[PDB]
Amino acid sequence: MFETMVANPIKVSRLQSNGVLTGPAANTKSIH
Amino acid sequence: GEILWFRGPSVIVNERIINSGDPHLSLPLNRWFTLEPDVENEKESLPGPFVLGLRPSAKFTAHRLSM
Amino acid sequence: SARISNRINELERLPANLGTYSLDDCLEFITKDDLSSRMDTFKIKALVELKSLKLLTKQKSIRQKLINNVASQAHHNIPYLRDSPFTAAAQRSVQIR
Amino acid sequence: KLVDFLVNVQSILNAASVKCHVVDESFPAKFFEKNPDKIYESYCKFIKNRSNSELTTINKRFENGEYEPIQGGFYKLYHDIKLVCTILIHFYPQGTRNYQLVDKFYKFSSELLLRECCRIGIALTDDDATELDKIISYDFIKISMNYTVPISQTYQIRTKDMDLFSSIISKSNLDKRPHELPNTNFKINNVLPQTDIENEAPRLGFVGANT
Amino acid sequence: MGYYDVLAGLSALEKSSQVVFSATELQQLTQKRVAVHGYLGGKVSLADAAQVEYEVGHSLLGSYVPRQQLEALSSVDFSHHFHRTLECKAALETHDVFLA
Amino acid sequence: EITIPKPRSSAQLEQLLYRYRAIQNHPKENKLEIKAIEDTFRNISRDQDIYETKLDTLRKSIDKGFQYDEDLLNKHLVALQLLEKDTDVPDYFLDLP
Amino acid sequence: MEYKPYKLIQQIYIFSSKNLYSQATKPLLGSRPSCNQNWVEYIFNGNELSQNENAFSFMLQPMQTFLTLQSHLTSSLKDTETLLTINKEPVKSTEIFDIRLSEGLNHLMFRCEDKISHETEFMNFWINVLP
Amino acid sequence: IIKLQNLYNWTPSNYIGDDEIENFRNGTPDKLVSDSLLKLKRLRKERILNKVLKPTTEERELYFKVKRILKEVILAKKVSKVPINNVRAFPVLQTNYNGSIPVVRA
Amino acid sequence: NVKKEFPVNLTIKKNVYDSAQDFNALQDESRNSRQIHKVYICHTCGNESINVRYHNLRARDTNLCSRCFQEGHFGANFQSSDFIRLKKNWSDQEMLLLLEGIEMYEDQWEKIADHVGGHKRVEDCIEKFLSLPIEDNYIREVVGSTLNGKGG
Amino acid sequence: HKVYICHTCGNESINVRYHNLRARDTNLCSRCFQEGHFGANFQSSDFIRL
Amino acid sequence: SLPIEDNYIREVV
Ligand SMILES: [Zn+2]
């Protein structure tokens, strides 16, 4: 079995790999 | 919660640090003191790979624990 | 320049695998599988010194830009220079229509 | 030596079991063998008997002075450690937090006892078939060094495109439960440790290049 | 070059006993600034800079490696390269001189 | 003559001994490196004996009640370290003591 | 799962090529000798293993491309053996095969069949040849 | 004659001079150490002013002499206290393994 | 209505005069002729484990170059009998033990030499202590104290 | 705060990351560094613990 | 404010 399946690889962008900033103050276009 | 599958089997490393100076590792030049393969060949069964790595004494750990 | 080049040579001839045993790893009961939280302390210092020695001209350029842009405005930003009768007389003489 | 050694070992084991409480667990306290490589098995047998014919921790054995500075006391300590670790490993679930805590503690304590006993002069307990071996034994004299270490395992599958592998399985070397394939078609691959010791590395100027 | 250097080379390789020195071999073994860049002033002509010879020397990968190329290098090959050029150079030089 | 020079460090002496141990079994062929190696060994053993005798004479005739001041010893340790690892000792660090 | 020790296969050896060794120790009065000189050997015992865990993994330095595989059989009868590389088929020269791996990840399937009692035994080997 | 007891046990710092014996017997070895450190510093300055890296032999000899003098002073317990300031770590090599995920190599 | 100095990373730098005293990680395995490696590693994946057998190699062809010292090797020009019938460089475990001994026993050199092991004498421990790198903050403090004593 | 993500598995690294000294953009989990789950042209000496 | 070059300037002068 498992011969007909496909991988569905995991892709990670370098921007996502180093410099994601979070919180409710993440985006500047927010009242918060 | 799903299994991550990699393209290569993982890697196992016994010791993370090695004794850069050791008769077992760094064979010295001019061995001073002690058909067929040879008579001077000698084997040594180590009690574990920890002999090749840096470990602190139990005494110093206890000393640091006392304070 | 000779001294700096010699130091950079010595720094670059170091090994990459340059961990450090910190003698405080006793309290961190490492079990040959964990990772010591201080393996990269001499490697970080070596890298910092090497890169700081390689970015010397950049620091020089920024320093000279700062110095020039703060000197050109001496007579306008420093009081005891701006208030002498000679600097005032010169700045007036420039603006004579 | 041995007196201060036992004192230090007791203090260390008390300090390292704050999260695991391995020292504060109670085992039947009347069990003992000679060869360690069968302990679990024998314990099972023991259980059966005392389970059909129907006590102390390690700190209690320390304060009562049960480990003598002779090899007997050291072997008793090693035996009790391995016993409590096997018990708590088979008690907790396969991959929970306390499972891996107990495994880590076992590794630490066993390595500590082995190194220390070897430092005081105490112990707790062929190349013919290949032509490569023939020519090597003919050309060079061999200064040898032998040691053993368990191997690890992972899951491996095959798909339309490629072969894929899993992370290393965190199953302890004391786990005797046979296995449980989460799915069929899962192959079990055996990962072998790394051989080289003085494996070279590039200079520092290689990773600190100017860009 | 030097007698002890020759001995260290002949001992690195295990063919130290396959060498014999002669008399003469033993007796001989015992013995302005052109502005390149412009980060600080007004740069001189690029032709003038090319006319001068550059010598960094101290660095290993030269004074510049592009980002993509360095990011996509192989570490094993370069480790072996440094082992051949930096550490094993004397043994290979002796093997070039002696040992045919 | 030939007069193999004095070994700079102990590794050089070890490699001298290795070269001699390799040459031994062909004396009629080499016949010249052996004599220089042996003269060097003689000089080294002589120097070692002289050093042992001088050390024995030194340790038994040091002083009765002299002692070293701690401040000067600390300054000397720091200066020795700095000079040993190619750093610089400021000018006001040794003349003034 | 279960525990199934092998019956036909016994003491499979995978070691470095003798030709690489000869060319690294003897330069044929030509070029320079190498500097790494790491020669390995991997032995697998038929018994004390399991037929349910028949895969093994290890890595090799880029110069360790040429390997050789030696097989011994407890079944002293006539058996059918097939070695599969990356799904080509090498031919032997107790059997001896010479393998030339490729950079990346290689898969070796060694298969024995009895054909008298009709028993099959497999051994899978995943090998990494680093760039 | 040659003694292996001496070949095995020898270092380039085994050349005691009469100055040490005198400055020990007559007390005040510290003066010798201070003068030798001054000479070392002067030699290093001269070695810097003209571009040369390898220290000369006399610098090695002064360094060895200072080390021996301080060693024999401390060993003879001729100091009240010894200052103990050490970096409580030390550099050591570290195992170096490769990545197992193979390269795509487009 | 003080001069903060660039750190003196002494642990990184090397000894200028006698480079045979650097830490084993910083030394160059090229003066003792140990650059080229001849290794032979035999594994055995028998029973849920591996019996690694590591072999260093020395040329069996070399006569009296890879064999232990014995009396029959040296002629009448030597006095090696008693010495041969009856260490010298440090290691990393021994350096660690020296640091721990200094940390526990400040100046009691005999207890330190006993903590390290029976191989090292007191003199060797004193040498290694003299050659150990010192902290940077203490160096700054000492140099600044001298500077302030000069200037005031 | 700030969030970092392993370059190999999508999972985010916690309390520590292994910065690649050559890529200068790709960071790794602690586990994916312990098990050598990076590219086959990188060695363990190319990463630094932050 | 980074004493990158101070040691060498000081030791040469
Ligand atoms: Zn990850």
Coordinates of C-alpha atoms and ligand atoms in Angstrom, one line a residue, chain J residues 6-11 28-30 32, ligand 1:
Chain J
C6 CA 12.4 25.8 11.6
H7 CA 13.4 25.7 8.0
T8 CA 12.8 22.0 7.6
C9 CA 9.6 21.3 9.6
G10 CA 6.9 23.9 9.9
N11 CA 7.0 23.7 13.7
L28 CA 16.5 25.1 12.9
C29 CA 14.7 23.5 15.7
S30 CA 16.7 22.0 18.6
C32 CA 16.1 18.9 13.9
Ligands
ZN1 ZN 12.3 21.8 13.0

